[model samples]
Target: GSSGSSGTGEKPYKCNECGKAFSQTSKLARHQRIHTGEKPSGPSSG
Candidate 1:
């Protein structure tokens, strides 16, 4: 599973909470917050 061809445009994990799709499950987890209106904390609010 670690050494496989990096397929092009192969999205496997689809978020049930949101319609967003990702190639990896971890990436999907990170993207899920976008749907909930959450953003990464920065040095200051612009």
Candidate 2:
């Protein structure tokens, strides 16, 4: 799969729907919340 293990501190949990990523799960979770409405179950919009 999409592995970027170049020592970035294991910050993985990419939102494939929108391809938007973050440094942590919680961070991405909340960020996607803004999208979780329209995008609903994933990430979206630029």
Candidate 3:
């Protein structure tokens, strides 16, 4: 299932942990990080 500016307006990628829906799988994966407690690996830049 998928949705966006395409044809159908349905969000297929949904976060199982939080139940948050995303338009793209990439977006859903990123959102899962919040639940997994995954942090960005890199030096802080100002």
Candidate 4:
């Protein structure tokens, strides 16, 4: 079976910062850690 371009479904979670699209919510959030530079448990400087 030949696999062509991926699905054209809704990629609701996308990075506006870089226009990167993620099909899963976790994928977006996980990627956000780098973009946001803030971790859920790590201390943040305010």
Where does candidate 1 clash, by residue pair? none
**TM-score-best of 1 and 3:** 3
lDDT, candidates in the order shown: 0.69, 0.65, 0.72, 0.73
lDDT, candidate 2, 1-46, per-residue tens: 5676345565568676676667778887877676557544544446
Candidate with better TM-score, 1 vs 4: 4
Lowest summed lDDT over 10 consecutive residues: which window, candidate 1?
Answer: 37-46
TM-score, candidate number 4: 0.57
Instruction: For candidate 3, list the clashing residue pairs, or say none.
Output: none
Q: What alpha-carbon RMSD in Å does predicted model 4 have with respect to the real structure?
A: 7.7
lDDT of 3 at 34: 64
Comparison by lDDT, 1 against 3, better one? 3
What is the C-alpha lDDT profile of model 1 across 1-46, one tens digit per residue?
6665555686767787755567788999887766566775556422
Steric clashes per prediction: 0, 0, 0, 0
Put the candidates in lDDT order, highest first: 4, 3, 1, 2
Give per-model TM-scores.
Answer: 0.42, 0.47, 0.55, 0.57
Q: By TM-score, highest first, what's the ranking?
A: 4, 3, 2, 1
Give me the overall lDDT of model 3.
Answer: 0.72
